[PDB]
Design a protein around this ligand. Structure first.
Ligand SMILES: c1ccc(-c2ccccc2)cc1
Ligand SMILES: c1ccc(-c2ccccc2)cc1
Ligand SMILES: c1ccc(-c2ccccc2)cc1
Ligand code: FES
Ligand code: FES
Ligand code: FES
Ligand SMILES: [Fe+2]
Ligand SMILES: [Fe+2]
Ligand SMILES: [Fe+2]
Lengths: 432, 181, 181, 432, 181, 432
């Protein structure tokens, strides 16, 4: 078995070393479902996925099927999509409206709250209030819905901590808040979830180098070539004080935003009444938001978004060697009809399974996972030494542990917290 | 919002049926042999290349199966954005298709419908797209295409003015959609 | 018992060939878009809808590959029992197809033969039935259909009098056969 | 490796609780092949599947391929379909007639008894009498052929015990005995065998509630719908004194038989000479078999049938997450052609992979097993409390431990015996 | 090197198109019903039956995808060699096909071209070969065929002078190639 | 975990017994990757596969992807096809010529020696010469390129030992040496590698009995049938003194060569200037090579070839239940063009995926592996008793431990050495 001492030596944030077995090992993965996914806050979607009473979304927490459902009192509930009788799935569609939920196996009926309210032949053949599906804790953050099984786990706000200001770049720009664009794309990648989560946590490096050369080329005019494409170098990276969360962004490099989102969005982000209302609201953080572009973020373990592009996705783990990508797009509720359309179009073009950027990430992760089947490929540590000891907590513009955009400080913090969650059984030590 | 294709009661002539079929067989050959600039040439300036999302819905909510024109999609493209994709796939630094995949577009079930405009036809067809890449990766797709084709003076005899791909999937089982439908 | 389909040396006319092919393409559209009432309307009162079991035999005992008419089958149906199957599939409480699956009937290899009754035709065809349901469930079927089709005054031009479906399987790899062939 | 104490805690028949891990755990499954399938009496088919000399049927005992073949002395032998040289399949077809069996790898020849009679180049390179494939103990119960590897196990009749009267409802109606209708239907379901074994053992509940509403509707006249359909409520359930066997049936509900099998079978089962001969042949049990309809039964572990419908099936395990279903139909040998055809047609219509009843079982089981991939779905006990404490041994009509038709006493017994077989290494304690 | 099939600008006549299509449908029937002696009769004395290896190459080294005529291949056959293959497949001791497999050759995408010799034709067709055997084995193949077909006085109307099978696979995902393409 | 005592119990060369679990156990397989494939000499191909500077071939060592690349200094280097940053595959094509190798994830550039020569933004964000992909030892034997990860392991010559002479029958026929015919065929077989590795090591028996009767029939004259074809019985088998290598061949039965290879290959091998030159060059071993026909050989673990047919194959393990067969053909560099063509032609006809011989091998191996899923199928040992104690070292014609053509002495050596490598942790005792 994986002893805490053996688990602690899998990650070395001091030397910048990672044991490749963390991406591959079966028994480690099984520890993750318990130690990581069973007590972390996990993204299920947006409040606008479930606007009115009885509205639901069939989604996941780790490998546990769950139902997110809007209540009469305007609150959101999350229960395990499993009948406690013999285990049958209670909610059998992706989304819609429910007056109730009935099991198709033996007819145990549930209200929209997940309360067991009817059992056929109950008098003829025990308390119903004691046998409903397992309830998860529900906490919202500016439109985003998060869930957590563990009652002893810290509240969302504390869990997020100093990473919140970086979420507000995407979420807190308008007083009316964000809304999710209709539809949620789902596809399957044969790779470990930590590859996907780390990339949006710390990895601008891959976009600034070789991965997305053809992605930039696709967003570049036919007469223009990659030699005329300016390499971005200016920017910063953030590692969360607690949580394993991380973010990276470019500073004064609006070429990168243009090559992805086009002129109409680039203008909406940087110039005009809306761009001005944003920096006023985000003034208390002290961040030059109108100057931040190409931003990536991960809220540990599997909530990842691209604040400049409004691209959000959830990584559902499916063993050590497979994930599911569940991705959606946000827009400001009051944003013009032309602007919403531009966010919609460019997100599809760039970040869906067929996306000109997304296609290449899938190719990379798949070939890494395949390699980790080899013995010697797991025998030596992987390099995570970028920006080792170059970041400091006193930046004039950006709060928290901030360094260079091309670094792995956010990465080292992500894996270190992963290590911590896997080796510490009690929140007594784990909590911030 | 799709439903059964409205085939005409009077079936299209044998000449036109063979013309549309040979077109798709030719188009498939270009796609399977990676002739991308030759394939892109078929796309009219006003093309809408569309692949909506598909969801699991109860019979009672069957109207909600496909995503709307203002929802996200797998593909929602114009002539300009389509060329970007042709730039990417022919690129030496486009890793998803370098090395390139080995695809097969098997076409059948071709139903031709004439429209108010002569030489412009609404076409329905079914396909199975078999994709094999790298050492062992196999991705099989099935579905139908709903095209609006125009008579053209090119090498294939027709141009594509519109294309809706209805894919037989909800969650995509492939890691990407690097191929063209 | 079945062996090679006894095709006529003289091939069917182009007009007839096209009509039968177009009938199947329309039928596939009906099935894939879940127009079950409209598809059942094609079934004649005397319909025999049949799918025999197929077994692994040594070449010496090759006459015993298929199950007989007094043996068990996957389907052995009449108009009356098919109606019930249509009743179940269209039902809100029919859990196997609610939410419904996503099918593709790719039809090809159509060989048309005249019978001893005018306007009645014996048709041999091949298919791949791709069935996708729920989140990740994929069931691929392949085989041949041996039909007896009648000219009819309907939307499709033909009615179904007999259907024998020869599936390329011994053990079924699908958990059910909630789809129509 | 699981300890006997840890295995005993997986099932609790007193409280009516089941650990969901039993359907999913890999190492529990590897135990099941040794502890359960390695020493249980397992259905292989019917005598009439192999009527003449040399007639064989390739089948399974768990995941071990076996050959059942009729001998010249009319006895039936069963041996492992594995050559002891280098493991090749000796019998490579589904069924047929053999005069001999020859290995295709190195040409070791065998007779129809499974004895090694010829080894090529034996003189140039050991006793052939010691190197034939493993032989199973074979026993026949009123037509049905059973097999068991374990020489220390209780014989068939003793193993069956007080479950025998309920088998005879199907098997002992005529002096001529039953014959198997030709055809063995095979399909694959991604679920644990225990769900399927239990349903036929104890679960009339699923048919009398929600699972088969569309199945009933399929038989219902075009001018009628479900609102007019009678819901059977009268009946009983049997738990075997030993073995985890079970059965359940409706009492005085001929409409429930009509709705499934049609009028001609309902007539044959309830009224006339044949029905009266059947009750007088089972007079020793004291059971009103003419009033017993819709019956379900499991002979633990994986022998399941539907006595009133003449449907029989074997569940071959294929890991914790998969089974194969091997189904066939019986009829009384001297039954009128009209009745045999009605049993054949309705069994295809209802209980094949395409069956209007079957479809919805496979659909339910697939979802349950998917749900058990999740960590939280395996963390809480499943409810098995139906009919708890309501069963008694002194029923005037039906012998043995009997309760109400909608109970889970037969299930608790199946799971208790499963637990016993799994936790008790020796037959010294395990036998009746 | 193979590249896009050089289809004629003027497509073949409806009659000829139908003849070539029907030829393959009958051919697939012969193979899928194990009429091997009858299928072998279709092969001319100068038959080249060829299936080259396919490899993963960078777009740059694309000319090196397929193996050459002096490299190894999956099939590189003459009439004499095919004879031995037919002799084995029909044998009681041909263990790979005894018990025999259950195959479906689904032919479509037929493009016909008239060659140098009159009544000799250059044909391109896409296929999927579904192969099911024993209990649960399923091997799926996809690709295109490049045929030289001469008019012949047999039951199918044509004979096969040359066949090149371009398989969509680098590494073969099947344990063997006991079937015929 | 598997104890050294338990490992020794799995193989008994004295009684000639084998535990079936060796082909099925997942924990033994994982140990094989470390204890066998981690330190054995593994074939990668031929020097002619990489003749020019920069020419590479992507292949495998166990489940580790490796790159074999020719250097400017005419030597060959073998390194792990894995970037040490985040595990991305460096060389992403089957074969070709390279000037540099570049990772597609973050752009770490490598030379054709596997040295990390460039890191994007290195100065802006650790020693490059320390972070190159794990290098393997490379040693060539008369055209054939072998590789080994273990620096403590004996050199290739010492590893091969008295098996070298039998490799010379194929490799040492001309001063011109051998050349690999273009093209390497690759296919997947769902079976354990040890079945495949043993067959070529020791198993003439399968080809001498039933496996290839249809293969012979396919190559035999059209006017001749099986009952007219002569069965070869004369020949010998060789067990290596150390390493688990083994070879087998027919003696004075050229009709066996004629059926498989045709008359022209038969003539070239047995008669003429080339046949007598090959017997002169191998005169130091005293072997009458012209009389040796239909030879087979394995160099432990996964290097197998048929010398007389010039067919060579590497088995890539893919779990205990799967392999990949990568096959290529040799010819004498100075052989007649018609001989080169006859070797090319008959290898395709006989030994490819669709080969008239190969077809049946896969068919057998598949059904063996499927059978080993069962409990009882793994419960009794397999018979490896052929030619037990019938081999000797003082043979007039062939050097080493030699017995009859139909024997399992070489097999016992291969399994005994497998057992030795799996149990003994150090080359201190393991070495010859
Ligand atoms: C993680 C995910 C995406 C990106 C990114 C890609 C293209 C353009 C801008 C950012 C960076 C890190
Ligand atoms: C287990 C399996 C099937 C049934 C059943 C199905 C339909 C009608 C009557 C009983 C009951 C228990
Ligand atoms: C392993 C593989 C092939 C052969 C073999 C095949 C044909 C003729 C002679 C030997 C022997 C062992
Ligand atoms: S499983 Fe939900 S009621 Fe039985
Ligand atoms: S494996 Fe059965 S004879 Fe060798
Ligand atoms: S993985 Fe090779 S550079 Fe990042
Ligand atoms: Fe990316
Ligand atoms: Fe049921
Ligand atoms: Fe062999």
């Amino acid at each position: 078995n994986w002893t805490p001492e053996a688990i602690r030596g899998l990650v070395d944030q001091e030397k910048g070393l990672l044991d490749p077995r963390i991406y591959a090992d079966q028994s480690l993965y099984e520890l993750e479902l318990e130690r990581v996914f069973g007590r972390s806050w996990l993204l299920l979607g947006h409040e606008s996925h479930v606007p009115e009473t009885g509205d639901f979304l069939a989604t996941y927490m780790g490998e546990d099927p769950v139902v997110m459902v809007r209540q009469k009192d305007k609150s959101i509930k999350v229960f395990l999509n499993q009948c406690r009788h013999r285990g049958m799935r209670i909610c059998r569609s992706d989304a819609g409206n429910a007056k109730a939920f009935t099991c198709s196996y033996h007819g145990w009926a549930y209200d929209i709250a997940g309360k067991l309210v009817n059992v056929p032949f109950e008098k003829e053949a025990f308390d119903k209030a004691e046998w409903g599906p397992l309830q998860a804790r529900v906490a919202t953050y500016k439109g985003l819905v998060f869930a957590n099984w563990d009652v002893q786990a810290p509240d969302l706000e504390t869990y997020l901590g100093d990473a919140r200001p970086y979420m507000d770049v995407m979420l807190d720009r308008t007083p009316a808040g964000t809304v999710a664009i209709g539809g949620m794309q789902k596809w399957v990648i044969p790779c470990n979830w930590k590859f996907a989560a780390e990339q949006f946590c710390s990895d601008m490096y891959h976009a600034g180098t070789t991965t997305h050369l053809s992605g930039i080329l696709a967003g570049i005019p036919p007469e223009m070539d990659l030699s005329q494409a300016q390499i971005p170098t200016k920017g910063n990276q953030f590692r969360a004080a607690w949580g394993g969360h991380g973010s990276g962004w470019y500073v004064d490099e609006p070429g990168s935003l243009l090559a992805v989102m086009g002129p109409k969005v680039t203008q909406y982000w940087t110039e005009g009444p809306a761009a001005e209302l944003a920096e006023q609201r985000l003034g208390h953080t002290g961040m030059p938001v109108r100057r931040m572009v190409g931003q990536h973020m991960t809220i540990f373990p599997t909530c990842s978004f691209l604040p400049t592009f409004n691209n959000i996705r959830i990584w559902h783990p499916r063993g050590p060697n497979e994930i599911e990508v569940w991705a959606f797009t946000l827009v400001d509720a009051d944003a013009p009809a032309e602007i919403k359309e531009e966010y919609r179009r460019h997100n599809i073009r760039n970040f869906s399974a067929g996306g000109v950027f997304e296609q290449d990430d899938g190719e990379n992760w798949v070939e890494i996972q395949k390699g980790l089947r080899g013995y010697k490929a797991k025998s030596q540590p992987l390099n995570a030494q970028m920006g080792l000891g170059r970041s400091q907590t006193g930046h004039p513009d950006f709060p928290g542990n901030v360094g260079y955009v091309y670094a792995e400080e956010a990465a080292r913090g992500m894996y270190h917290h992963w290590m911590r969650m896997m080796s510490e059984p009690s929140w007594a030590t784990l909590k911030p | 919002f799709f439903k059964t294709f409205e085939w005409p009661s009077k079936a299209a002539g044998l000449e036109l049926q063979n013309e549309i079929e040979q077109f798709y067989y030719r188009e498939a050959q270009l796609l399977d042999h990676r002739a991308y600039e030759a394939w892109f040439a078929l796309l009219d300036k006003d093309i809408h290349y569309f692949m909506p999302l598909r969801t699991n819905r109860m019979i009672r909510e069957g109207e909600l199966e496909y995503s709307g024109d203002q929802d996200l999609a797998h593909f929602d493209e114009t002539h300009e954005t389509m060329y970007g994709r042709i730039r990417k796939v022919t690129s030496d630094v486009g890793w998803a298709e370098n090395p390139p995949s080995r695809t097969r577009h098997l076409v059948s079930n071709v139903i031709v419908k004439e429209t108010a405009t002569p030489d412009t036809f609404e076409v329905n067809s079914a396909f199975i797209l078999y994709r094999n890449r790298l050492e062992r990766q196999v991705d099989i797709f099935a579905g139908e295409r709903r095209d609006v084709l125009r008579r053209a003076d090119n090498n294939l005899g027709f141009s594509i003015a519109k294309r809706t791909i209805l894919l037989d999937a909800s969650t995509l089982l492939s890691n990407n959609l690097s191929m063209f439908f």
